[PDB]
Design a protein around this ligand. Structure first.
Ligand SMILES: CN[C@@H]1[C@@H](O)[C@@H](O[C@@H]2[C@@H](O)[C@H](O[C@H]3O[C@H]([C@@H](C)O)[C@@H](O)[C@H](O)[C@H]3N)[C@@H](N)C[C@H]2N)OC[C@]1(C)O
Ligand SMILES: CN[C@@H]1[C@@H](O)[C@@H](O[C@@H]2[C@@H](O)[C@H](O[C@H]3O[C@H]([C@@H](C)O)[C@@H](O)[C@H](O)[C@H]3N)[C@@H](N)C[C@H]2N)OC[C@]1(C)O
Ligand SMILES: Cc1ncc(COP(=O)(O)O)c(CN)c1O
Ligand SMILES: Cc1ncc(COP(=O)(O)O)c(CN)c1O
Ligand SMILES: [Cl-]
Ligand SMILES: [Cl-]
Ligand SMILES: [Cl-]
Lengths: 414, 414
């Protein structure tokens, strides 16, 4: 086709054989009027639900005013205050339009302050070539080294380059590793004096009202947000200590301060607080995951639930996931492949029961269509592969694997 | 304040002492209800006028549908077809959210295809550190060399690095240099086989329905657009030959394909065609500039008009511009400093006469407030300084200047 970039982080791939035309709350609707429970939510950018009435009213009033970009100083500063006030310490906030822009800007700030170039990384930070994964110990074309969330690989990069690193940037994750495991990655870098960036683009405002790493007893020099803050409107930020944010003074685009996205984001943060969204998702998602695990068990299918609350995953072999996903779609349940699911604030009350009923039907048709899968075992390699897709790293060194085997595994995935 | 990035390319700086609350058509309105003719138009991102009724209806319908990101395949492909169809050749289109993202992506594509790193540049391509200006012959921190629109500096970089360059990226401009001058910059690079990027972020869809360089008898391997295509909504693109666009397949963000901006952009391109916008601006802007020059002449003030149509500039010393701009604001006319003005499609009919009447009053109060300025001469250095701010380069080597003097001048501006 003529659109060159319809690949990568594009959501709703399971539904490419149907046509989605409307979204409302927890549901999206196809061209035939069928409602589907949406667990993609634009890859987690929709934290409140589609067409949230308060976000929509704020955007509509802003559009109808016609106020041009960079004129709504009170609103822009207010959103910055909202974001900074949820982080421990004294932060300034620089706004961008995508998560990739925010993470590259955070890295650029660290390079400007330290005068160093090399960056070490765990996780996916966006589409820019600076974030392209290369094997352990091999700097990519923009001088970024990738450590795959392993403390031993962080230790190697620190042993060889601690004096040379502008920063370490870590995307936290908690489905397959603990908060203590994530905190240890940050602390190893802090102890040698390396600037830290907590890449909260995925989890910021999803797991709690602020940065996920705060609850892991971590503080970072800079934090990046995008998905959680704006309910599907294109806004992101770097929030961090003044020393690192001052070099971003001129990091501005013509439409950095277009008003509709600021209105959406400020309303989103207020609504997340008002509806107690992250705490309620912890409860409702836990119920979904526990009941899903029970249904899988009674049907003897080779799937395991991992995680809970706002971030959980159907762990299974690729061959099994390729059956699960179409069977769920046929029952009106949209799941993202090779990733966590992304429930929104609308995944509460009867919506959870509706989703469970649809999953129950999908598991029944799956077992009837593919009886050869009933009784199949989930292997260690299934679990490792599922973790590597979800968190873009290894969930610690798997039991029985040497560090060399970990490096060979990761290299083979690229 | 807590917003770290309120500097740089932020529009409406002349109005930082007043509060703008509404925009409609050619006008914005302050908190006291006063209407001001807007010649910033969000630094030229508003090509149709604030709250264009057709763009607004398309956006509102899209917001009210709640359709999530990446679901409106027909609309996304349609916009790509609209853009590619206005360029000679067979293009594919990769979408981004800001002009800076598009120009960095175009440069990255050239690096991927050629396997080379060094880039040569004329003009401003955005806020990323890769676009930070350094003196002639000094590569910046991301291996970009800056040539300041001078053919002799392009020749030096080609003499030293032609075999090494991934691409040359040129932002065209036509206020202070001719289309033939711009074409020569591209042709010098073509002849030695270097990939060319026409950075049309400012002029694409402003001067004609497509790339400005097309009318200068230029073709480029890639083109970047942003300001002209979306009437203030955050959307940009790289449009170019398949060989260069294929490496951008995975250059995607979660909200690359959020629907409101695509609806705005597709409606904007249709409206620009329907209202014959660029041709009509050529006429109305020419009338404004000619009459403005006449009024300046009768009042004997040290200002010269440069350019015409959709892109013109009040050329004067910084000391004079600092009087002109507040005096124009006091008469309800918003001008951008140290740049061209950016009239929109609403700058037609009686709006042009209204703007001329306001300018006439501002010139009268200026002459009465600052009688010492009456009869002052505009110097060569005034003209060169004005060109350097507007086009981020030299308008050819000024008369009587050596190439060394040009290099020293540019170095002193950084
Ligand atoms: C197979 N090589 C992959 C490479 O393709 C790429 O994978 C990304 C992956 O990281 C992204 O996925 C990542 O980002 C998404 C978010 C963007 O929606 C998160 O939801 C998800 O948890 C995270 N794994 C996915 N969206 C696209 C793949 N091409 O980056 C990591 C990698 C291992 O190098
Ligand atoms: C004084 N050093 C400057 C440096 O500050 C910067 O200048 C930019 C300038 O290029 C931009 O201006 C540029 O981009 C704007 C567009 C973005 O609105 C265009 O309208 C304008 O014609 C163009 N000159 C201006 N918006 C911000 C300055 N800091 O980039 C060029 C430079 C010469 O290195
Ligand atoms: C953790 C993380 N960091 C950064 C990014 C990049 O953000 P974006 O897709 O908005 O460019 C992503 C991908 N969305 C992400 O999940
Ligand atoms: C010619 C040119 N190129 C690229 C850019 C960068 O675009 P943006 O401000 O949208 O990031 C600009 C500045 N807007 C520009 O004028
Ligand atoms: Cl709902
Ligand atoms: Cl009007
Ligand atoms: Cl961006």
């Amino acid at each position: 086709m003529i659109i060159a970039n319809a690949d990568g982080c594009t959501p709703y791939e399971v539904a490419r054989g149907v046509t989605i035309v409307r979204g409302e709350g927890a549901y999206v609707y196809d061209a035939e009027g069928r409602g589907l429970i949406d667990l993609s939510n634009s890859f987690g950018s929709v934290m409140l639900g589609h067409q949230d009435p308060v976000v929509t009213e704020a955007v509509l009033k802003t559009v109808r005013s016609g106020v041009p970009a960079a004129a709504s100083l009170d609103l822009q500063n207010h959103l910055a205050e909202q974001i900074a006030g949820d982080l421990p310490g004294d932060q300034r906030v620089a706004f961008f339009k995508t998560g990739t822009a925010a993470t590259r800007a955070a890295a650029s700030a660290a390079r400007q302050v330290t005068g160093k170039r090399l960056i070490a990384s765990c996780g996916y930070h966006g589409y820019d070539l600076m974030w392209e994964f290369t094997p352990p110990g091999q700097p990519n074309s923009e001088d970024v080294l990738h450590c795959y969330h392993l403390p031993e690989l962080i230790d190697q990069v620190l042993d060889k380059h601690a004096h040379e690193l502008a920063a370490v940037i870590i995307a936290p994750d908690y489905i397959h590793v603990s908060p203590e495991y994530i905190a240890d990655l940050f602390e190893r870098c802090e102890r040698v004096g390396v600037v830290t960036i907590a890449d909260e683009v995925k989890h910021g405002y999803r797991l709690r009202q602020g940065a996920s790493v705060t609850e892991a007893s971590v503080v970072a020099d800079m934090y990046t947000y995008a998905k959680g803050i704006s309910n599907g409107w294109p806004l992101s930020c770097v929030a961090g200590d003044e020393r690192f944010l001052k070099p971003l003074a001129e990091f501005v685009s013509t439409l950095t301060f277009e008003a509709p996205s600021f209105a959406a984001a400020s309303a989103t943060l207020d609504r997340l607080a008002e509806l107690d969204v992250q705490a309620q998702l912890a409860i409702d998602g836990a119920r979904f995951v526990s009941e899903a695990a029970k249904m899988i068990s009674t049907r003897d299918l080779p799937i395991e639930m991992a995680g809970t609350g706002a971030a959980f995953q159907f762990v299974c072999a690729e061959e099994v996931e390729e059956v699960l996903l179409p069977h769920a779609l046929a029952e009106g349940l949209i799941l993202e492949p090779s990733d966590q699911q992304y429930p929104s604030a609308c995944f509460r009350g009867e919506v959870v029961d509706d989703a469970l009923e649809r999953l129950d039907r999908a598991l029944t048709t799956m077992a009837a269509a593919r009886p050869d899968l009933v009784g199949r075992e989930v292997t260690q390699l299934d679990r490792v592969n599922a973790a590597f897709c979800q968190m873009d790293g290894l969930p610690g060194r798997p039991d029985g694997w040497s560090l060399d085997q970990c490096v060979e595994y990761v290299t083979a995935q690229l």
